[PDB]
Amino acid sequence: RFASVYAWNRKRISNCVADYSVLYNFAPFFAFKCYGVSPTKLNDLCFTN
Amino acid sequence: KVGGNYNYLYRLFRKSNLKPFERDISTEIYQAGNKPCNGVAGFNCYFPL
């Protein structure tokens, strides 16, 4: 169950290997717009949080 | 121009890094790889320009 738009639910992801390639089990996305980064280069750059 | 000037374009990503002074007139779609893609598709079949 997702939260309201005003009470947008936040989780911090830290200390974990990020497999951003488990996104592509959820069906054709009306939008996957990756701003400032590429949808392909994201599974490479390490990040703090 | 107000929300215009499309005639001036560039590429955010390419199948491979360009060689020095290399020119590419084509604009074909980058292959997704995980999903057959001759028509438009998801992850990586977005238009480069």
PDB file of N, CA and C in Angstrom:
ATOM      1  N   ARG A   1       0.855  -1.185   0.000  1.00  0.00           N
ATOM      2  CA  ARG A   1       0.000   0.000   0.000  1.00  0.00           C
ATOM      3  C   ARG A   1       0.888   1.231   0.000  1.00  0.00           C
ATOM      4  N   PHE A   2       0.711   2.096  -0.991  1.00  0.00           N
ATOM      5  CA  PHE A   2       1.484   3.323  -1.094  1.00  0.00           C
ATOM      6  C   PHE A   2       0.816   4.442  -0.302  1.00  0.00           C
ATOM      7  N   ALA A   3       1.602   5.467   0.013  1.00  0.00           N
ATOM      8  CA  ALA A   3       1.131   6.578   0.822  1.00  0.00           C
ATOM      9  C   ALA A   3       0.555   7.679  -0.067  1.00  0.00           C
ATOM     10  N   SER A   4       0.025   8.720   0.571  1.00  0.00           N
ATOM     11  CA  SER A   4      -0.557   9.836  -0.155  1.00  0.00           C
ATOM     12  C   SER A   4       0.531  10.637  -0.866  1.00  0.00           C
ATOM     13  N   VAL A   5       0.095  11.574  -1.711  1.00  0.00           N
ATOM     14  CA  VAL A   5       1.043  12.402  -2.446  1.00  0.00           C
ATOM     15  C   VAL A   5       1.717  13.401  -1.512  1.00  0.00           C
ATOM     16  N   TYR A   6       0.957  13.977  -0.579  1.00  0.00           N
ATOM     17  CA  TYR A   6       1.549  14.919   0.365  1.00  0.00           C
ATOM     18  C   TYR A   6       2.408  14.193   1.394  1.00  0.00           C
ATOM     19  N   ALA A   7       1.964  13.025   1.846  1.00  0.00           N
ATOM     20  CA  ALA A   7       2.750  12.188   2.754  1.00  0.00           C
ATOM     21  C   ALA A   7       3.524  11.135   1.962  1.00  0.00           C
ATOM     22  N   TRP A   8       4.324  11.620   1.014  1.00  0.00           N
ATOM     23  CA  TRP A   8       5.130  10.727   0.190  1.00  0.00           C
ATOM     24  C   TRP A   8       6.089   9.930   1.063  1.00  0.00           C
ATOM     25  N   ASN A   9       6.057   8.608   0.912  1.00  0.00           N
ATOM     26  CA  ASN A   9       6.841   7.724   1.765  1.00  0.00           C
ATOM     27  C   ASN A   9       8.302   7.757   1.333  1.00  0.00           C
ATOM     28  N   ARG A  10       9.233   8.021   2.273  1.00  0.00           N
ATOM     29  CA  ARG A  10      10.716   7.977   2.015  1.00  0.00           C
ATOM     30  C   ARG A  10      11.402   6.791   2.714  1.00  0.00           C
ATOM     31  N   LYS A  11      12.248   6.043   1.993  1.00  0.00           N
ATOM     32  CA  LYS A  11      13.253   5.119   2.579  1.00  0.00           C
ATOM     33  C   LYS A  11      14.658   5.557   2.157  1.00  0.00           C
ATOM     34  N   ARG A  12      15.601   5.556   3.106  1.00  0.00           N
ATOM     35  CA  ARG A  12      17.044   5.743   2.821  1.00  0.00           C
ATOM     36  C   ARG A  12      17.655   4.383   2.495  1.00  0.00           C
ATOM     37  N   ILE A  13      18.336   4.297   1.355  1.00  0.00           N
ATOM     38  CA  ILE A  13      19.080   3.081   0.960  1.00  0.00           C
ATOM     39  C   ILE A  13      20.552   3.411   1.164  1.00  0.00           C
ATOM     40  N   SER A  14      21.211   2.660   2.052  1.00  0.00           N
ATOM     41  CA  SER A  14      22.639   2.844   2.420  1.00  0.00           C
ATOM     42  C   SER A  14      23.250   1.481   2.784  1.00  0.00           C
ATOM     43  N   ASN A  15      24.585   1.388   2.848  1.00  0.00           N
ATOM     44  CA  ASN A  15      25.311   0.144   3.136  1.00  0.00           C
ATOM     45  C   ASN A  15      24.737  -1.117   2.429  1.00  0.00           C
ATOM     46  N   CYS A  16      24.438  -1.076   1.122  1.00  0.00           N
ATOM     47  CA  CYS A  16      23.870  -2.219   0.426  1.00  0.00           C
ATOM     48  C   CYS A  16      24.251  -2.144  -1.046  1.00  0.00           C
ATOM     49  N   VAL A  17      24.525  -3.303  -1.640  1.00  0.00           N
ATOM     50  CA  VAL A  17      24.818  -3.373  -3.068  1.00  0.00           C
ATOM     51  C   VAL A  17      23.542  -3.064  -3.839  1.00  0.00           C
ATOM     52  N   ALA A  18      23.606  -2.056  -4.707  1.00  0.00           N
ATOM     53  CA  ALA A  18      22.446  -1.586  -5.458  1.00  0.00           C
ATOM     54  C   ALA A  18      22.455  -2.232  -6.839  1.00  0.00           C
ATOM     55  N   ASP A  19      21.551  -3.186  -7.052  1.00  0.00           N
ATOM     56  CA  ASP A  19      21.372  -3.822  -8.356  1.00  0.00           C
ATOM     57  C   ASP A  19      20.330  -3.013  -9.115  1.00  0.00           C
ATOM     58  N   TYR A  20      20.643  -1.909  -9.757  1.00  0.00           N
ATOM     59  CA  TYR A  20      19.493  -1.153 -10.339  1.00  0.00           C
ATOM     60  C   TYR A  20      18.844  -1.892 -11.521  1.00  0.00           C
ATOM     61  N   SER A  21      19.213  -3.146 -11.761  1.00  0.00           N
ATOM     62  CA  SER A  21      18.674  -3.907 -12.913  1.00  0.00           C
ATOM     63  C   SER A  21      17.624  -4.895 -12.438  1.00  0.00           C
ATOM     64  N   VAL A  22      16.924  -4.555 -11.370  1.00  0.00           N
ATOM     65  CA  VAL A  22      15.762  -5.373 -10.944  1.00  0.00           C
ATOM     66  C   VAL A  22      14.619  -4.399 -11.157  1.00  0.00           C
ATOM     67  N   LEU A  23      14.896  -3.243 -11.728  1.00  0.00           N
ATOM     68  CA  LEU A  23      13.794  -2.350 -12.128  1.00  0.00           C
ATOM     69  C   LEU A  23      12.967  -3.006 -13.225  1.00  0.00           C
ATOM     70  N   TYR A  24      13.572  -3.843 -14.070  1.00  0.00           N
ATOM     71  CA  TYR A  24      12.960  -4.232 -15.374  1.00  0.00           C
ATOM     72  C   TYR A  24      12.216  -5.548 -15.218  1.00  0.00           C
ATOM     73  N   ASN A  25      11.422  -5.606 -14.156  1.00  0.00           N
ATOM     74  CA  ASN A  25      10.430  -6.660 -13.879  1.00  0.00           C
ATOM     75  C   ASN A  25       9.087  -5.961 -13.809  1.00  0.00           C
ATOM     76  N   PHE A  26       9.120  -4.678 -13.488  1.00  0.00           N
ATOM     77  CA  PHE A  26       7.902  -3.842 -13.487  1.00  0.00           C
ATOM     78  C   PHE A  26       7.685  -3.317 -14.905  1.00  0.00           C
ATOM     79  N   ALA A  27       6.437  -3.359 -15.372  1.00  0.00           N
ATOM     80  CA  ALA A  27       6.077  -3.377 -16.807  1.00  0.00           C
ATOM     81  C   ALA A  27       6.318  -2.001 -17.431  1.00  0.00           C
ATOM     82  N   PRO A  28       6.404  -1.874 -18.774  1.00  0.00           N
ATOM     83  CA  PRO A  28       6.573  -0.605 -19.481  1.00  0.00           C
ATOM     84  C   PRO A  28       6.169   0.680 -18.770  1.00  0.00           C
ATOM     85  N   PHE A  29       7.165   1.478 -18.463  1.00  0.00           N
ATOM     86  CA  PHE A  29       7.006   2.595 -17.523  1.00  0.00           C
ATOM     87  C   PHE A  29       6.643   3.815 -18.340  1.00  0.00           C
ATOM     88  N   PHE A  30       5.511   4.421 -18.005  1.00  0.00           N
ATOM     89  CA  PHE A  30       5.041   5.647 -18.685  1.00  0.00           C
ATOM     90  C   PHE A  30       6.199   6.636 -18.639  1.00  0.00           C
ATOM     91  N   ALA A  31       7.175   6.384 -17.766  1.00  0.00           N
ATOM     92  CA  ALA A  31       8.324   7.302 -17.660  1.00  0.00           C
ATOM     93  C   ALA A  31       9.437   6.662 -16.841  1.00  0.00           C
ATOM     94  N   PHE A  32      10.668   6.718 -17.331  1.00  0.00           N
ATOM     95  CA  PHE A  32      11.835   6.193 -16.592  1.00  0.00           C
ATOM     96  C   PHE A  32      12.824   7.329 -16.679  1.00  0.00           C
ATOM     97  N   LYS A  33      12.299   8.525 -16.909  1.00  0.00           N
ATOM     98  CA  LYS A  33      13.197   9.676 -17.145  1.00  0.00           C
ATOM     99  C   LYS A  33      14.288   9.704 -16.090  1.00  0.00           C
ATOM    100  N   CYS A  34      15.529   9.527 -16.519  1.00  0.00           N
ATOM    101  CA  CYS A  34      16.654   9.639 -15.572  1.00  0.00           C
ATOM    102  C   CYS A  34      17.290  10.998 -15.817  1.00  0.00           C
ATOM    103  N   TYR A  35      17.114  11.923 -14.889  1.00  0.00           N
ATOM    104  CA  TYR A  35      17.615  13.283 -15.038  1.00  0.00           C
ATOM    105  C   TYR A  35      19.030  13.359 -14.484  1.00  0.00           C
ATOM    106  N   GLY A  36      19.926  13.993 -15.239  1.00  0.00           N
ATOM    107  CA  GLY A  36      21.310  14.133 -14.840  1.00  0.00           C
ATOM    108  C   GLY A  36      22.151  12.886 -14.976  1.00  0.00           C
ATOM    109  N   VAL A  37      21.541  11.725 -15.216  1.00  0.00           N
ATOM    110  CA  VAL A  37      22.258  10.469 -15.379  1.00  0.00           C
ATOM    111  C   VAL A  37      21.605   9.688 -16.512  1.00  0.00           C
ATOM    112  N   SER A  38      22.267   8.590 -16.910  1.00  0.00           N
ATOM    113  CA  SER A  38      21.746   7.748 -17.974  1.00  0.00           C
ATOM    114  C   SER A  38      21.101   6.493 -17.395  1.00  0.00           C
ATOM    115  N   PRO A  39      20.080   5.939 -18.057  1.00  0.00           N
ATOM    116  CA  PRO A  39      19.421   4.748 -17.496  1.00  0.00           C
ATOM    117  C   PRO A  39      20.301   3.511 -17.503  1.00  0.00           C
ATOM    118  N   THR A  40      21.428   3.684 -18.219  1.00  0.00           N
ATOM    119  CA  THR A  40      22.366   2.563 -18.429  1.00  0.00           C
ATOM    120  C   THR A  40      23.606   2.746 -17.579  1.00  0.00           C
ATOM    121  N   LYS A  41      23.934   3.979 -17.235  1.00  0.00           N
ATOM    122  CA  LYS A  41      25.211   4.166 -16.506  1.00  0.00           C
ATOM    123  C   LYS A  41      24.965   4.140 -15.003  1.00  0.00           C
ATOM    124  N   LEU A  42      23.711   3.998 -14.583  1.00  0.00           N
ATOM    125  CA  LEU A  42      23.402   4.108 -13.141  1.00  0.00           C
ATOM    126  C   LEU A  42      23.927   2.909 -12.361  1.00  0.00           C
ATOM    127  N   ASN A  43      23.979   1.732 -12.975  1.00  0.00           N
ATOM    128  CA  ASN A  43      24.528   0.530 -12.299  1.00  0.00           C
ATOM    129  C   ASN A  43      26.045   0.500 -12.410  1.00  0.00           C
ATOM    130  N   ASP A  44      26.723   1.596 -12.060  1.00  0.00           N
ATOM    131  CA  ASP A  44      28.204   1.676 -12.159  1.00  0.00           C
ATOM    132  C   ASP A  44      28.698   2.657 -11.111  1.00  0.00           C
ATOM    133  N   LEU A  45      28.225   3.892 -11.181  1.00  0.00           N
ATOM    134  CA  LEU A  45      28.609   4.970 -10.235  1.00  0.00           C
ATOM    135  C   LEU A  45      28.252   4.598  -8.796  1.00  0.00           C
ATOM    136  N   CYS A  46      29.228   4.634  -7.883  1.00  0.00           N
ATOM    137  CA  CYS A  46      28.915   4.393  -6.456  1.00  0.00           C
ATOM    138  C   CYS A  46      28.387   5.713  -5.912  1.00  0.00           C
ATOM    139  N   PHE A  47      27.579   5.662  -4.854  1.00  0.00           N
ATOM    140  CA  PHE A  47      26.963   6.880  -4.282  1.00  0.00           C
ATOM    141  C   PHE A  47      26.816   6.655  -2.783  1.00  0.00           C
ATOM    142  N   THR A  48      26.747   7.733  -2.002  1.00  0.00           N
ATOM    143  CA  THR A  48      26.702   7.610  -0.534  1.00  0.00           C
ATOM    144  C   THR A  48      25.370   7.058  -0.039  1.00  0.00           C
ATOM    145  N   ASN A  49      24.253   7.626  -0.497  1.00  0.00           N
ATOM    146  CA  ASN A  49      22.878   7.258  -0.148  1.00  0.00           C
ATOM    147  C   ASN A  49      21.994   7.337  -1.413  1.00  0.00           C
TER     148      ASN A  49
ATOM    149  N   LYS B   1      14.871  30.648 -28.521  1.00  0.00           N
ATOM    150  CA  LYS B   1      13.460  30.764 -28.846  1.00  0.00           C
ATOM    151  C   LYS B   1      12.649  30.161 -27.712  1.00  0.00           C
ATOM    152  N   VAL B   2      11.445  30.696 -27.504  1.00  0.00           N
ATOM    153  CA  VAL B   2      10.621  30.236 -26.390  1.00  0.00           C
ATOM    154  C   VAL B   2      10.265  28.774 -26.609  1.00  0.00           C
ATOM    155  N   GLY B   3      10.818  27.900 -25.768  1.00  0.00           N
ATOM    156  CA  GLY B   3      10.596  26.460 -25.876  1.00  0.00           C
ATOM    157  C   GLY B   3      10.847  25.970 -27.299  1.00  0.00           C
ATOM    158  N   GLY B   4      11.900  26.480 -27.930  1.00  0.00           N
ATOM    159  CA  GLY B   4      12.208  26.134 -29.304  1.00  0.00           C
ATOM    160  C   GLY B   4      13.680  25.856 -29.535  1.00  0.00           C
ATOM    161  N   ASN B   5      14.148  26.091 -30.759  1.00  0.00           N
ATOM    162  CA  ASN B   5      15.538  25.856 -31.141  1.00  0.00           C
ATOM    163  C   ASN B   5      15.889  24.372 -31.151  1.00  0.00           C
ATOM    164  N   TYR B   6      14.946  23.524 -31.568  1.00  0.00           N
ATOM    165  CA  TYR B   6      15.202  22.097 -31.709  1.00  0.00           C
ATOM    166  C   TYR B   6      16.279  21.791 -32.738  1.00  0.00           C
ATOM    167  N   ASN B   7      16.498  22.686 -33.705  1.00  0.00           N
ATOM    168  CA  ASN B   7      17.431  22.405 -34.791  1.00  0.00           C
ATOM    169  C   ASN B   7      18.844  22.164 -34.272  1.00  0.00           C
ATOM    170  N   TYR B   8      19.158  22.658 -33.079  1.00  0.00           N
ATOM    171  CA  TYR B   8      20.455  22.442 -32.449  1.00  0.00           C
ATOM    172  C   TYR B   8      20.328  21.303 -31.448  1.00  0.00           C
ATOM    173  N   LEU B   9      21.010  20.192 -31.722  1.00  0.00           N
ATOM    174  CA  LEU B   9      20.839  18.969 -30.951  1.00  0.00           C
ATOM    175  C   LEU B   9      22.193  18.443 -30.498  1.00  0.00           C
ATOM    176  N   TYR B  10      22.146  17.347 -29.745  1.00  0.00           N
ATOM    177  CA  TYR B  10      23.338  16.632 -29.315  1.00  0.00           C
ATOM    178  C   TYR B  10      22.929  15.229 -28.887  1.00  0.00           C
ATOM    179  N   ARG B  11      23.893  14.482 -28.356  1.00  0.00           N
ATOM    180  CA  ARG B  11      23.668  13.126 -27.877  1.00  0.00           C
ATOM    181  C   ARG B  11      24.032  13.034 -26.403  1.00  0.00           C
ATOM    182  N   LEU B  12      23.125  12.464 -25.607  1.00  0.00           N
ATOM    183  CA  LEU B  12      23.424  12.211 -24.201  1.00  0.00           C
ATOM    184  C   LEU B  12      24.235  10.935 -24.016  1.00  0.00           C
ATOM    185  N   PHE B  13      23.958   9.906 -24.810  1.00  0.00           N
ATOM    186  CA  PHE B  13      24.665   8.640 -24.700  1.00  0.00           C
ATOM    187  C   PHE B  13      24.805   8.025 -26.084  1.00  0.00           C
ATOM    188  N   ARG B  14      25.792   7.142 -26.220  1.00  0.00           N
ATOM    189  CA  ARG B  14      26.060   6.466 -27.480  1.00  0.00           C
ATOM    190  C   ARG B  14      26.521   5.049 -27.182  1.00  0.00           C
ATOM    191  N   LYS B  15      26.400   4.179 -28.191  1.00  0.00           N
ATOM    192  CA  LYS B  15      26.821   2.793 -28.027  1.00  0.00           C
ATOM    193  C   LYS B  15      28.289   2.685 -27.646  1.00  0.00           C
ATOM    194  N   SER B  16      29.127   3.614 -28.100  1.00  0.00           N
ATOM    195  CA  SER B  16      30.535   3.623 -27.745  1.00  0.00           C
ATOM    196  C   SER B  16      31.048   5.053 -27.794  1.00  0.00           C
ATOM    197  N   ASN B  17      32.118   5.305 -27.046  1.00  0.00           N
ATOM    198  CA  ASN B  17      32.706   6.636 -27.018  1.00  0.00           C
ATOM    199  C   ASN B  17      33.300   6.981 -28.376  1.00  0.00           C
ATOM    200  N   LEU B  18      33.080   8.218 -28.815  1.00  0.00           N
ATOM    201  CA  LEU B  18      33.553   8.644 -30.124  1.00  0.00           C
ATOM    202  C   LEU B  18      35.073   8.739 -30.154  1.00  0.00           C
ATOM    203  N   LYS B  19      35.643   8.398 -31.305  1.00  0.00           N
ATOM    204  CA  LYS B  19      37.055   8.626 -31.537  1.00  0.00           C
ATOM    205  C   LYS B  19      37.299  10.106 -31.829  1.00  0.00           C
ATOM    206  N   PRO B  20      38.527  10.588 -31.648  1.00  0.00           N
ATOM    207  CA  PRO B  20      38.800  12.007 -31.900  1.00  0.00           C
ATOM    208  C   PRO B  20      38.403  12.418 -33.310  1.00  0.00           C
ATOM    209  N   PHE B  21      37.714  13.554 -33.408  1.00  0.00           N
ATOM    210  CA  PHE B  21      37.291  14.104 -34.692  1.00  0.00           C
ATOM    211  C   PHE B  21      36.450  13.104 -35.477  1.00  0.00           C
ATOM    212  N   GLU B  22      35.840  12.149 -34.784  1.00  0.00           N
ATOM    213  CA  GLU B  22      34.935  11.214 -35.436  1.00  0.00           C
ATOM    214  C   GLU B  22      33.537  11.813 -35.536  1.00  0.00           C
ATOM    215  N   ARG B  23      32.914  11.631 -36.697  1.00  0.00           N
ATOM    216  CA  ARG B  23      31.601  12.192 -36.976  1.00  0.00           C
ATOM    217  C   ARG B  23      30.623  11.068 -37.283  1.00  0.00           C
ATOM    218  N   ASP B  24      29.412  11.180 -36.736  1.00  0.00           N
ATOM    219  CA  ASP B  24      28.380  10.161 -36.898  1.00  0.00           C
ATOM    220  C   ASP B  24      27.086  10.858 -37.297  1.00  0.00           C
ATOM    221  N   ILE B  25      26.665  10.665 -38.552  1.00  0.00           N
ATOM    222  CA  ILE B  25      25.414  11.252 -39.030  1.00  0.00           C
ATOM    223  C   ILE B  25      24.198  10.445 -38.620  1.00  0.00           C
ATOM    224  N   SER B  26      24.362   9.155 -38.343  1.00  0.00           N
ATOM    225  CA  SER B  26      23.236   8.301 -38.008  1.00  0.00           C
ATOM    226  C   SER B  26      22.684   8.648 -36.628  1.00  0.00           C
ATOM    227  N   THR B  27      21.448   8.196 -36.373  1.00  0.00           N
ATOM    228  CA  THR B  27      20.819   8.397 -35.074  1.00  0.00           C
ATOM    229  C   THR B  27      20.065   7.147 -34.622  1.00  0.00           C
ATOM    230  N   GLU B  28      20.558   5.963 -34.983  1.00  0.00           N
ATOM    231  CA  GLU B  28      19.847   4.732 -34.668  1.00  0.00           C
ATOM    232  C   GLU B  28      19.732   4.548 -33.158  1.00  0.00           C
ATOM    233  N   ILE B  29      18.792   3.690 -32.757  1.00  0.00           N
ATOM    234  CA  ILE B  29      18.479   3.516 -31.345  1.00  0.00           C
ATOM    235  C   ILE B  29      19.469   2.545 -30.719  1.00  0.00           C
ATOM    236  N   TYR B  30      19.881   2.841 -29.487  1.00  0.00           N
ATOM    237  CA  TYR B  30      20.749   1.933 -28.745  1.00  0.00           C
ATOM    238  C   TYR B  30      19.965   0.694 -28.329  1.00  0.00           C
ATOM    239  N   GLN B  31      20.564  -0.475 -28.532  1.00  0.00           N
ATOM    240  CA  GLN B  31      19.878  -1.730 -28.241  1.00  0.00           C
ATOM    241  C   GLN B  31      19.762  -1.939 -26.737  1.00  0.00           C
ATOM    242  N   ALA B  32      18.609  -2.457 -26.301  1.00  0.00           N
ATOM    243  CA  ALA B  32      18.422  -2.755 -24.885  1.00  0.00           C
ATOM    244  C   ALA B  32      19.168  -4.015 -24.470  1.00  0.00           C
ATOM    245  N   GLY B  33      19.277  -4.990 -25.361  1.00  0.00           N
ATOM    246  CA  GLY B  33      19.987  -6.233 -25.055  1.00  0.00           C
ATOM    247  C   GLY B  33      19.183  -7.273 -24.307  1.00  0.00           C
ATOM    248  N   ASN B  34      18.554  -6.886 -23.196  1.00  0.00           N
ATOM    249  CA  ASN B  34      17.775  -7.836 -22.410  1.00  0.00           C
ATOM    250  C   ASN B  34      16.401  -8.102 -23.013  1.00  0.00           C
ATOM    251  N   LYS B  35      15.993  -7.323 -24.011  1.00  0.00           N
ATOM    252  CA  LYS B  35      14.679  -7.443 -24.623  1.00  0.00           C
ATOM    253  C   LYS B  35      14.818  -7.178 -26.119  1.00  0.00           C
ATOM    254  N   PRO B  36      14.313  -8.070 -26.977  1.00  0.00           N
ATOM    255  CA  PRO B  36      14.445  -7.842 -28.424  1.00  0.00           C
ATOM    256  C   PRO B  36      13.807  -6.519 -28.813  1.00  0.00           C
ATOM    257  N   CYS B  37      14.520  -5.745 -29.632  1.00  0.00           N
ATOM    258  CA  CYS B  37      14.162  -4.356 -29.859  1.00  0.00           C
ATOM    259  C   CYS B  37      14.509  -3.942 -31.280  1.00  0.00           C
ATOM    260  N   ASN B  38      13.518  -4.040 -32.169  1.00  0.00           N
ATOM    261  CA  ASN B  38      13.604  -3.430 -33.490  1.00  0.00           C
ATOM    262  C   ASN B  38      12.647  -2.248 -33.514  1.00  0.00           C
ATOM    263  N   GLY B  39      11.461  -2.440 -32.940  1.00  0.00           N
ATOM    264  CA  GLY B  39      10.599  -1.335 -32.590  1.00  0.00           C
ATOM    265  C   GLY B  39      11.031  -0.703 -31.280  1.00  0.00           C
ATOM    266  N   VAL B  40      10.368   0.404 -30.938  1.00  0.00           N
ATOM    267  CA  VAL B  40      10.720   1.111 -29.714  1.00  0.00           C
ATOM    268  C   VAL B  40      10.424   0.218 -28.516  1.00  0.00           C
ATOM    269  N   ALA B  41      11.143   0.457 -27.420  1.00  0.00           N
ATOM    270  CA  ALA B  41      11.077  -0.409 -26.254  1.00  0.00           C
ATOM    271  C   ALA B  41      11.486   0.391 -25.025  1.00  0.00           C
ATOM    272  N   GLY B  42      11.798  -0.327 -23.949  1.00  0.00           N
ATOM    273  CA  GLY B  42      11.959   0.297 -22.651  1.00  0.00           C
ATOM    274  C   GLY B  42      13.387   0.731 -22.376  1.00  0.00           C
ATOM    275  N   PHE B  43      14.048  -0.055 -21.525  1.00  0.00           N
ATOM    276  CA  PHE B  43      15.260   0.351 -20.818  1.00  0.00           C
ATOM    277  C   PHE B  43      16.208   1.207 -21.650  1.00  0.00           C
ATOM    278  N   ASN B  44      16.688   0.691 -22.781  1.00  0.00           N
ATOM    279  CA  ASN B  44      17.756   1.369 -23.509  1.00  0.00           C
ATOM    280  C   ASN B  44      17.386   1.713 -24.944  1.00  0.00           C
ATOM    281  N   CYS B  45      16.139   1.503 -25.355  1.00  0.00           N
ATOM    282  CA  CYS B  45      15.753   1.777 -26.732  1.00  0.00           C
ATOM    283  C   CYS B  45      15.208   3.192 -26.890  1.00  0.00           C
ATOM    284  N   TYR B  46      15.618   4.100 -26.011  1.00  0.00           N
ATOM    285  CA  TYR B  46      15.253   5.500 -26.129  1.00  0.00           C
ATOM    286  C   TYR B  46      16.122   6.192 -27.179  1.00  0.00           C
ATOM    287  N   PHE B  47      15.546   7.208 -27.808  1.00  0.00           N
ATOM    288  CA  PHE B  47      16.201   7.861 -28.934  1.00  0.00           C
ATOM    289  C   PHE B  47      17.352   8.736 -28.438  1.00  0.00           C
ATOM    290  N   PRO B  48      18.551   8.613 -29.034  1.00  0.00           N
ATOM    291  CA  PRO B  48      19.716   9.330 -28.492  1.00  0.00           C
ATOM    292  C   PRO B  48      19.576  10.848 -28.477  1.00  0.00           C
ATOM    293  N   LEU B  49      18.872  11.409 -29.457  1.00  0.00           N
ATOM    294  CA  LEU B  49      18.853  12.857 -29.619  1.00  0.00           C
ATOM    295  C   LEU B  49      17.805  13.496 -28.721  1.00  0.00           C
TER     296      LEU B  49
END
